[PDB]
Amino acid sequence: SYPIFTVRWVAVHTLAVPTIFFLGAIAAMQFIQR
Amino acid sequence: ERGWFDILDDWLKRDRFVFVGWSGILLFPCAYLALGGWLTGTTFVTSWYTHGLASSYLEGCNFLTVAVSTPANSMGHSLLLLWGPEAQGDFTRWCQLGGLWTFIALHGAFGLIGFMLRQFEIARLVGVRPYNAIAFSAPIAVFVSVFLIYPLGQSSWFFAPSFGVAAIFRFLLFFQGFHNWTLNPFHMMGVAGVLGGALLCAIHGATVENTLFQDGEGASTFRAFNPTQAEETYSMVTANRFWSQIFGIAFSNKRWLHFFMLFVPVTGLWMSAIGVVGLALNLRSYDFISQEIRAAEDPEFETFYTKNLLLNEGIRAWMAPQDQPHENFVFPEEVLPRGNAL
Amino acid sequence: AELTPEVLTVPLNSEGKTITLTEKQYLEGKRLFQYACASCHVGGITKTNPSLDLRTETLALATPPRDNIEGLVDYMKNPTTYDGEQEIAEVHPSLRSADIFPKMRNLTEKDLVAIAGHILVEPKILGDKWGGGKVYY
Amino acid sequence: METITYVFIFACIIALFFFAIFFREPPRIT
Amino acid sequence: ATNRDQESSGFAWWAGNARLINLSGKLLGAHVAHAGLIVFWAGAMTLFELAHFIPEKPMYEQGLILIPHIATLGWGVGPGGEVVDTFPFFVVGVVHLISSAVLGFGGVYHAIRGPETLEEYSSFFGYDWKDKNKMTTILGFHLIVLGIGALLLVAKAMFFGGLYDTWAPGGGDVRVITNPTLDPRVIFGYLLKSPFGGEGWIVSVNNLEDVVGGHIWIGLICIAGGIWHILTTPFGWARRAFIWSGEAYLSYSLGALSMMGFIATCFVWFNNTVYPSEFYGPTGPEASQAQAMTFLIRDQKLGANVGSAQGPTGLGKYLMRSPTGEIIFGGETMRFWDFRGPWLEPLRGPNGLDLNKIKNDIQPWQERRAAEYMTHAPLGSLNSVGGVATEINSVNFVSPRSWLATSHFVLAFFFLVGHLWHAGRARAAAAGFEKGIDRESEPVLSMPSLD
Amino acid sequence: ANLWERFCNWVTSTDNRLYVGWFGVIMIPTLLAATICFVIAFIAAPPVDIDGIREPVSGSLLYGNNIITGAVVPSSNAIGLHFYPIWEAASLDEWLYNGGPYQLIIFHFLLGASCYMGRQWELSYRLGMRPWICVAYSAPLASAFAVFLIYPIGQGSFSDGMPLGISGTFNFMIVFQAEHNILMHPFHQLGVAGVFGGALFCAMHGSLVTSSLIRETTETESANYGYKFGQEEETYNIVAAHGYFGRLIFQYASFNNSRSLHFFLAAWPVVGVWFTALGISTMAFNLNGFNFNHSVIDAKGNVINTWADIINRANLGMEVMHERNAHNFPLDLA
Amino acid sequence: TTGERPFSDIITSVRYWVIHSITIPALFIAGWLFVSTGLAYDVFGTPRPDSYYAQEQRSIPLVTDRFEAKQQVETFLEQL
Ligand code: CLA
Ligand code: CLA
Ligand code: CLA
Ligand code: CLA
Ligand SMILES: CC1=C(/C=C/C(C)=C/C=C/C(C)=C/C=C/C=C(C)/C=C/C=C(C)/C=C/C2=C(C)CCCC2(C)C)C(C)(C)CCC1
Ligand SMILES: CC1=C(/C=C/C(C)=C/C=C/C(C)=C/C=C/C=C(C)/C=C/C=C(C)/C=C/C2=C(C)CCCC2(C)C)C(C)(C)CCC1
Ligand SMILES: CC1=C(/C=C/C(C)=C/C=C/C(C)=C/C=C/C=C(C)/C=C/C=C(C)/C=C/C2=C(C)CCCC2(C)C)C(C)(C)CCC1
Ligand SMILES: CCCCCCCCCCCCO[C@@H]1O[C@H](CO)[C@@H](O[C@H]2O[C@H](CO)[C@@H](O)[C@H](O)[C@H]2O)[C@H](O)[C@H]1O
Ligand SMILES: CCCCCCCCCCCCO[C@@H]1O[C@H](CO)[C@@H](O[C@H]2O[C@H](CO)[C@@H](O)[C@H](O)[C@H]2O)[C@H](O)[C@H]1O
Ligand SMILES: CCCCCCCS[C@@H]1O[C@H](CO)[C@@H](O)[C@H](O)[C@H]1O
Ligand code: OEX
Ligand SMILES: [Ca+2]
Ligand SMILES: [Cl-]
Ligand SMILES: [Cl-]
Ligand SMILES: [Fe+2]
């Protein structure tokens, strides 16, 4: 009986979610040329 | 039936992986926004319109050169609220005007308040004296003096530190060239508190690790300690003899030792903040008047003090046109201070 | 702003004829300038003799004129002093002195044109910075 | 005057070192 | 798990290799596998260098540290250090890379398959760290091996094509060494030279006859010393002076390697004989001198009388005196007047730089060399932007001298630290207090009070 | 016993108020000499021709300095790395002009401080301690070697050694930034993380242990009387401390093992300072901080400045002004 | 402990990886497209390589007026 929605879960995702989005954005930027 | 306030208190103070508390309501959103604003700006946002610089990964900067830069000098000390009279609700314009600077600085300030309230809140619940909160007043005094008071004394937020690695380096070098900040005795006390603190950290960790009692058979000695053990894990008597014979004095009281470890770097940071309050006003330790009188009358008199001033004069002339673009400085090649050849 | 065909149009000769370089030519010229010339001419100055730079106006007043492709290519084969009076291949890299300046050994004619074009185009991009030295960094 | 003052303070600090070392409060184990 | 966890070995995972101290078989594996990593890097790095190499650019514009070592031995190069043949580089790379597979094989075998201890299997290959005679014997074998290595350099220099000689009359070239210096007054003289400016201890070695001669001496000294240690056991004064344990012997060797590292740093920074500037680029001193020579040449061509030209300070702008009178270049390069190099020596006479020779005899090749070296001074950024720290991006250059000096200072330093760590540890463990103070026999509690 | 044996027992005695030891026999005379020469020079040395251009810089109090401006001035650039003892000079007057005191001081100090480090190993052996306090001291020591010896070796002159004074130190720092871009060098960045972090953990540890002191005193007494030198029992509750800090961050971010904690307190500053020492010792051979000057370029090829370009402008100002009569040729190659 | 499932249990479970082998790549690709479509430029007002300067100006579009800085930027943008 371990819960899934917890304060910890929310805290983890407020960071992990944007982080992965940002890492994808920054990966793309490496192919931009002037 | 207990009251809603008390019920909310229970829930805020549940033992969980990440403690929340009443302090959490201020801390978490302000900290998250300060940090998210920095990551957003450094990844995506320019400084072309405020400084004439590129400042984001998007434009090609690296981790060393990205920043969230201060607003333009013509903004003065505007709060620069998203819904304020400069941006008028336009997110894109807000970003271009430096609105993320004030966003990060003000949410960061409220977040530091929330962090130190957290330190008091947790100390009270666990039953300890709140010295950790008290020590944290140093980082607060630094953040407030440098990010807030200093620019408030100057023309505008423009001259605050911009949030970035290279940008901060620029802030150091500006302070040398314009304020002669190395000469300032409040800075000097800061340096002594930081290097003295790092000295205490190293010497104390090393001393305990080299006067440990043999409490196990392991050659790796970390296992031979239990958190609930009543006994000292290292010999204070032996540590004291060692340092008395090596350096001439030694700690003999462990409570004094640990208090001194709080005192030194906290006091140093506080001294440095006082100096920066002075610099807000250009109230510098820039010169020694007696040195100037002599040097002016005696062209063979030279010291390291007069040498450093020549360096400062170079920094100001060579950096100001690009670092202060609102001034529209044009310094013809012929007026630039230079020594021979270079 | 852009690196347009116009930016890339420079004088071919002293008689006023122009040549429009390709973007591939521009990039080759930068690369080859780095390979063979930048050690002394980084940024349009000359480290071993700062009195002579690669500004277009300086090049125009050289003898023979060096403010055009043909003048530059000829310079790279048979370099002279600024007044045209002395041949300096023995102390300046050229095709003629490729035995003693070995980086010049595999430079083709096309390579010379590319490098000449870099020299002419860069000031149209950078202005006073080209040949300006540290004051303009 | 200034040189005497700076040297005097220094000399006092060196004297303080001598007393703080050799006329310290002895550490007492009991 | 014969000793492969913390509970049984007494060492945590991060000190895992300390579990090997008394496991001679696996420890031989560790060593042999490690030797294979070194040989692997030599081989693969060489091939990488060769694949990237453009023979008409200087080596030093291309970030090569290994090709330069091969060329200095006379392989692949001709007059002026021009590359005449890359195949000797390819051979050196390939043969190391193949040999590394063999060492790697032996290492993996001994580490994971062969007998963990060797003492049961062989009394010749087994060893106890406390057996003073066995330790001096193995030492002796390795001495003989090192001696032979030094004599291979002699063999290359005297019988198999010679060495690249930057000082060769008429210009740098490969040259066979027929008259190596054997006089002990010269060879051991170098060791008693001051390490300070104008002297430079062994770093001052400036001709290949001394270099070759010095290796004949070391070859024979090491072979003799090795025989000696096979035939003898430590004297009593040695027995009482040292700690006799694996960790102690490691510490001694760490101290020795730290020293050697600092020496190597100085060698590559200042010496342009065994690190020829043709391959490694100019020395820091060299390039600063070469700047002064460049502007002297330029300004004299414009009509300057460089002897009588007083600079802003009152010292000569181009030429001045050293503190012992010798004529030297002026400006900041006054500090570098102990510099000596083949492009500059023709201008030097018994009183230092000779003004007649400066005015009349400077050849175009000297102007070229000086301009080259001035523009490849060993200054640059960590991202390899050549030049002073305020330089703009354009030139991708950091001197091999800088890479080699910096790396080896870093390694020598951390090796000094390792020497202290392990020497302090070996002493404590030999005496029985490396795991802490015995609470019931705390030595300080039996000592009188200080006051 | 015989005289040698007695001497050896006295040298190595664990009962001398200050330990002597064999490292001590070299340390004592070399530190006394460096100290005495330093004190006299700082008060009364005349001006020294540091840059070898006959432009002597006044360092001493009697010649117009104060505590903040004063220094013992490095030896002349004309000397370079040459050994300049007193007996190389034709007279004390010459020796003073050319900066002889600097070399006597720094060589005796580095020798003596090196023996200080050995003496730390030595006393630890005599007391039956673990041996690695001397390893922690190797960090500041390495730093001293870097600025007084290794940087001069690399640049070819003791005139580029750090001066022995407050304003001289700032001068050395500003020129170093000009010539090496030290702020952009990751080893200096490791150094700052080491000292800012050492300060931070210093205050953290002090505050956490102080937070959790066991009540042993009344309100009208310093809590420090609650600990008696040599007592066997710990004077604070580490479990209460860990309970606090684990909640501040999260549980596994806090140490409950005092040995692990103390090792971390040792390691973090020592390592960062080893890196910063190595920053100075590798910039000594001119491998410099990152250079992103003109790294960002627009579609036409216009340079788009970054904060790295603005640093560059500041560095230029330092560069063109430093040692303003000493350069004749256009590049500062050392 | 405080009652939440250990991280080590979670991230070694098959269910976690079934969920996250979808959500992790999806977020990555969405961030990629935020840049590759040019949308990042327009949300944040960041110049593209071709929009720092008009073709013949070498004057930076610095904001000089607090209360119509919004309009100054607007005008600087129309003049490209
Ligand atoms: C504890 C959490 C917290 C705190 C302390 C702050 C604090 C701040 N925010 Mg942040 N913010 C937060 C959470 C927080 N925020 C969250 C969760 C978001 C995402 C939604 C944001 C998004 C955000 C943005 C986008 C911006 C800010 C800005 C600000 C600043 C100005 C706020 C302001 O003037 O409010 C004024 C409002 C109050 C003080 C509330 C008062 C309520 C009182 C007690 C009762 C009065 C009610 C009244 C009767 C209602 C009827 C009105 C009627 C007459 C019409 C300030 C630094 C601005 C800033 O940073 O600019 C640089 C800005 O642009 N915030
Ligand atoms: C040069 C680096 C190096 C070398 C040569 C060794 C060597 C060794 N270690 Mg140390 N170790 C190192 C680095 C190294 N270690 C590092 C960095 C750490 C910290 C992570 C450790 C931590 C450590 C611990 C904690 C222990 C050792 C132990 C050992 C030994 C037994 C290994 C074993 O049981 O493998 C078991 C592993 C396997 C069977 C998996 C495969 C291993 C092989 C060798 C991989 C080879 C791959 C290679 C590509 C094959 C090429 C083949 C081809 C040539 C034909 C062995 C002699 C153990 C001990 O001392 O035993 C007495 C032990 O407990 N080491
Ligand atoms: C320093 C390195 C070294 C040392 C001390 C040993 C020692 C040992 N080995 Mg390992 N081994 C090594 C490296 C080493 N080996 C390498 C590189 C490989 C891969 C080829 C092996 C593969 C290997 C296997 C597969 C076995 C051993 C075994 C043995 C044992 C018996 C050896 C014997 O009696 O031969 C006596 C002498 C000879 C047979 C003639 C020697 C011929 C060599 C080639 C002459 C050397 C020439 C020259 C000096 C080369 C120097 C190379 C250098 C430049 C790198 C002994 C414990 C056996 C064992 O452990 O028993 C259970 C065993 O089965 N060895
Ligand atoms: C890796 C090489 C190596 C190693 C580790 C050893 C190790 C050992 N040797 Mg062997 N030895 C070697 C090579 C080596 N040796 C060689 C090549 C020879 C041939 C010449 C010898 C000839 C030899 C003899 C004749 C003896 C030893 C002895 C010993 C033992 C004592 C060493 C000692 O106390 O030195 C420490 C040095 C001293 C105590 C001398 C005083 C310290 C001075 C002042 C240090 C100066 C250093 C300084 C940095 C300056 C350097 C430059 C200088 C020229 C100015 C020890 C087992 C002794 C022994 O036990 O024989 C069985 C012994 O009598 N060796
Ligand atoms: C601003 C704003 C806002 C907010 C936003 C947010 C909140 C955001 C967040 C965001 C985020 C949250 C992001 C993140 C990102 C991240 C990243 C980008 C990361 C990266 C990383 C890396 C890269 C790593 C690296 C490393 C390290 C660190 C160490 C170890 C090693 C290595 C190197 C790996 C709002 C809307 C309210 C409003 C308006 C404005
Ligand atoms: C013990 C141990 C360890 C270690 C290991 C090692 C150290 C190993 C080594 C190994 C080695 C050391 C290996 C090597 C290998 C090699 C090889 C495999 C080679 C091959 C070659 C080839 C195949 C070639 C080819 C070619 C040619 C011939 C020509 C040109 C081209 C080319 C290159 C392609 C560890 C840490 C894991 C841990 C556990 C234990
Ligand atoms: C090749 C060459 C050469 C030659 C070389 C030689 C001939 C060398 C030799 C070398 C040697 C011949 C070396 C030696 C070394 C030694 C040492 C390094 C020692 C050490 C010692 C110790 C460390 C000790 C310690 C101790 C003490 C002091 C006290 C008691 C205790 C004990 C024992 C611990 C030349 C330069 C001509 C040229 C180039 C090339
Ligand atoms: C510049 C370098 C010049 C030095 C040359 C070095 C030569 C190496 C050979 C040294 C031979 C001396 O040998 C060594 O002498 C000392 C001097 O009393 C001895 O003597 C002693 O040992 C005991 C053992 O605990 C001591 O407590 C005692 O005080 C002492 O008399 C050593 O036990 C002996 O082994
Ligand atoms: C135990 C050590 C204690 C040391 C105490 C030493 C005091 C006794 C010796 C007195 C020597 C000082 O003598 C010194 O000489 C020169 C003359 O060429 C003077 O000349 C100087 O004047 C001014 C004084 O402000 C200086 O700024 C200047 O750089 C210099 O030209 C000094 O002002 C004078 O004080
Ligand atoms: C360990 C393998 C060594 C292989 C050595 C190859 C011989 S080396 C060979 O020798 C000739 C003179 O004898 C020289 O003239 C020639 O230049 C040289 O490369
Ligand atoms: O001396 Mn002291 O500082 Ca090293 O760089 Mn060059 O030299 Mn001088 O100029 Mn910059
Ligand atoms: Ca384009
Ligand atoms: Cl110069
Ligand atoms: Cl200066
Ligand atoms: Fe502690």
Q: Which candidate, C94, C60, C98, C99, places its Cα nearest to that of C80? A: C94
Whose alpha carbon is nearest atom 58 of ligand 1? B81
Structure tokens at E13: 């995972």
CA dihedral over F78, F83, F85, F89, signed as positive or negative: negative
Q: What is the residue whose two structure tokens read 């100037």?
A: B292
C136: DSSP letter: G
d(CA E277, CA E342): 10
CA C1 to centroid of ligand 12, rounded, Å: 9
Task: Say if residues E334 and E320 touch (Cβ distance below 8 Å).
Answer: yes
d(CA F291, CA E167): 37
d(CA B24, CA F248): 11
d(CA F330, CA F77): 19
B47 three-class SS:
strand
Dihedral-angle region of residue B122 (phi above 0 means left; psi in -120 to 50 means alpha; beta otherwise): alpha
What letter represents residue F233's amino acid? E
- Please state whether beta strands E348-349 and E327-329 pair in parallel, antiparallel, or not at all (unpaired): unpaired
Strand-pair partners of B283: none
- Whether A25 and chain B come into contact, CB under 8 Å, resolves to yes
Task: Say if residues G11 and G24 touch (Cβ distance below 8 Å).
Answer: no
Touching chains E and C? (3+ Cβ pairs < 8 A): yes
Q: Which candidate, E124, E68, F197, D11, places its Cα nearest to that of B195? A: F197
d(CA F207, CA B255): 11
Q: Which candidate, E429, B247, E291, places its Cα nearest to that of F331? A: E291
Q: Which helix (H) or strand (E) holds B164?
A: strand B163-164
d(CA C36, CA C25): 16
CA dist E183 to B68, E153, E156, E180, F310, Å? 70, 19, 21, 9, 60
By the 10 Å C-beta count (0-12 exposed, 13-18 middle, 19+ buried), B36 is classed as middle
Structure tokens at B308: 């450093």
C18 three-class SS:
strand
Count of helix runs (H) and strand runs (E) in chain B: 13, 2
Q: Which helix (H) or strand (E) holds C30?
A: helix C23-36
Task: Say if residues F293 and E391 touch (Cβ distance below 8 Å).
Answer: yes
F253: DSSP letter: G
User: What does B300-335 look like in DSSP terms, one character per residue?
Assistant: T---HHHHHHHHHHHHHHHHHHHH-GGG-----GGG
The alpha carbon of residue G73 is apart from the nearest alpha carbon of chain C, in Å, by 17
By the 10 Å C-beta count (0-12 exposed, 13-18 middle, 19+ buried), E446 is classed as exposed
d(CA B69, CA B48): 10
- Number of the ligand closest to the Cα of B88: 1
What letter represents residue B272's amino acid? S
Q: Which candidate, E180, F132, C71, places its Cα nearest to that of B207? A: F132
G4: DSSP letter: S
By the 10 Å C-beta count (0-12 exposed, 13-18 middle, 19+ buried), F261 is classed as buried
Contacts of G8 in chain F (CB under 8 A): none
By the 10 Å C-beta count (0-12 exposed, 13-18 middle, 19+ buried), E164 is classed as buried
d(CA B242, CA F137): 14
Q: Provide the H-helix boundaries in chain F.
A: 3-11, 21-44, 92-97, 100-126, 133-145, 151-155, 166-180, 186-211, 238-248, 258-283, 307-321
Contacts of C2 in chain G (CB under 8 A): 50, 55
CA dihedral over E161, E165, E168, E174, signed as positive or negative: positive
- Whether E350 and chain F come into contact, CB under 8 Å, resolves to no
d(CA B45, CA B61): 11
d(CA G47, CA G60): 12
D12 three-class SS:
helix
Distance between terminal CA atoms of chain A? 55
Contact A28 G35 (CB under 8 A): yes
- Whether A11 and chain G come into contact, CB under 8 Å, resolves to no
Whose alpha carbon is nearest atom 21 of ligand 3? E106
Find all residues with CB under 8 Å of F203, minimum gap 6, and list them.
B135, B138, B197, B261, B262, B265, B266
Q: Which residues of E are annotated as a binding site for [CaMn4O5] cluster?
A: 345
By the 10 Å C-beta count (0-12 exposed, 13-18 middle, 19+ buried), E41 is classed as middle
Q: Which helix (H) or strand (E) holds C115?
A: helix C109-126
Buried/exposed C99-113: b ≥16 CB within 10 Å, e otherwise: ebbbbbeebeeebbb
Closest-approach residue (CA) in chain B for D17: B248
Q: For chain B, how many structural domains are there in total?
A: 1
Neighbours of E326 (CB within 10 A): 15
Structure tokens at F191: 């150094």
Q: Cα angle at G46 between G45 and G48, to 5 degrees?
A: 125
Chain A window 15-34: which residues touch F at a Cβ cutoff of 8 Å?
Answer: 34
Neighbours of C62 (CB within 10 A): 17
HEC string of chain E?
CCCCCHHHHCCCHHHHHHHHCCCHHHHHHHHHHHHHHHHHHHHHHHHHHHHHCCCCCCHHHCCCCHHHHHHHCCCCECHHHCECCCHHHHHHHHHHHHHHHHHHHHHHHHHHHCCCCCCCCCCCCCCCCCCHHHHHHHHHHHHHHHHHHHHHHHHHHHHCCCEEECCCCCCCEEECCCCCCCCHHHHHHHHHCCCCCCCCHHHHCCCHHHHHHHHHHHHHHHHHHHHHHHHCCCCHHHHHHCCCCHHHHHHHHHHHHHHHHHHHHHHHHHCCCCCCHHHHCCCHHHHHHHHHHHHHHHHHHCCCCCCCCECCCCCECCEEECCCCCEEECCHHHHHCCCCCCCCHHHEECCEECHHHHHHCCCHHHHHHHHHHHCCCCCEECCCEECCCCCCCCCECCCHHHHHHHHHHHHHHHHHHHHHHHHHHHHHHHHCCCCCECCCCCHHHHCCCCC
Contacts of F309 in chain C (CB under 8 A): 137
The alpha carbon of residue F28 is apart from the nearest alpha carbon of chain D, in Å, by 16
CATH number where G7 lies: 1.20.5.860
- Number of the ligand closest to the Cα of B104: 1
Residues with Cβ–ion distance below 5 A, ligand 13? E 331-332; F 327-329
d(CA E381, CA E390): 10
Q: Which candidate, F197, F195, F222, F221, places its Cα nearest to that of F210? A: F222
Structure tokens at B184: 């300032």
Task: Say if residues E177 and E212 touch (Cβ distance below 8 Å).
Answer: yes
- Number of the ligand closest to the Cα of G31: 5
Contacts of E292 in chain C (CB under 8 A): none
- Whether E122 and chain C come into contact, CB under 8 Å, resolves to no
G24 three-class SS:
helix
d(CA B158, CA B161): 8
Find all residues with CB under 8 Å of F332, minimum gap 6, and list them.
B342, E332, E388, F179, F319
Task: Say if residues C33 and C118 touch (Cβ distance below 8 Å).
Answer: yes
CA dihedral over B148, B154, B157, B159, signed as positive or negative: negative
CA F91 to centroid of ligand 6, rounded, Å: 65
By the 10 Å C-beta count (0-12 exposed, 13-18 middle, 19+ buried), E257 is classed as middle
Calculate Rg over the CA atoms of chain A: 15
Cis peptide upstream of residue F56 (ω within 30 degrees of 0): no
Q: Does residue B33's CB lie within 6 angstroms of at least one atom of ligand 5? A: yes
Contact D3 F43 (CB under 8 A): yes
Q: Count of CB contacts below 8 A, E vs F?
A: 220
Q: Provide the angle, in degrees to the nearest 10, between the axes of the packed helices G14-36 and A7-29.
A: 40
C1 three-class SS:
coil
Q: What is the residue whose two structure tokens read 């306030």?
A: B5
**Domain ranges across chain C:** 1-137
Closest-approach residue (CA) in chain E for F89: E323
The whole domain housing B188 covers 1-342
- Closest atom of ligand 9 to CA, residue F64: 27
Domain C1-137 is in which class? mainly alpha
What are the two backbone dihedrals, phi and then psi, of residue E278, each rounded to the nearest 5 degrees? -50, -35
The alpha carbon of residue A17 is apart from the nearest alpha carbon of chain G, in Å, by 7
d(CA E200, CA E339): 11
E strand spans, chain C: 9-11, 18-20
By the 10 Å C-beta count (0-12 exposed, 13-18 middle, 19+ buried), F46 is classed as middle
User: What does B52-120 look like in DSSP terms, one character per residue?
Assistant: SB--SGGGT--TTT-EEPPPPGGGTT----TTSTTTTT-HHHHHHTTHHHHHHHHHHHHHHHHHHHHHH
What letter represents residue E113's amino acid? R
Structure tokens at G41: 């430029």
What are the two backbone dihedrals, phi and then psi, of residue E289, each rounded to the nearest 5 degrees? -60, -45
CA dist E104 to E21, E26, E35, E107, E146, Å? 21, 13, 8, 5, 22
Strand-pair partners of B212: B234
d(CA F187, CA F277): 8
What letter represents residue C95's amino acid? L
The alpha carbon of residue G23 is apart from the nearest alpha carbon of chain B, in Å, by 21
B213 three-class SS:
strand
Q: Which candidate, E249, E42, E16, places its Cα nearest to that of E127? A: E249
Whose alpha carbon is nearest atom 15 of ligand 4? E225
By the 10 Å C-beta count (0-12 exposed, 13-18 middle, 19+ buried), G76 is classed as middle
Structure tokens at C124: 């149209």
Task: Say if residues B174 and B316 touch (Cβ distance below 8 Å).
Answer: no
Q: Which candidate, E125, E99, E142, E132, places its Cα nearest to that of E27? A: E125
Taking CB atoms within 8 Å and a gap of at least 24, the contacts of F9-14 are F12/F122, F12/F126, F14/B245, F14/E447, F14/F126, F14/F127
F164 three-class SS:
strand
Instruction: Using an 8 Å CB-CB cutoff, list residues of chain F that contact chain D.
Output: 17, 43, 61-62, 66-67, 229-230
C11 three-class SS:
strand
**Domain ranges across chain E:** 1-281+378-451, 282-377
Contacts of D20 in chain B (CB under 8 A): 248-249
Contacts of B174 in chain F (CB under 8 A): 314
CATH architecture of the domain with range E282-377: Orthogonal Bundle (1.10)
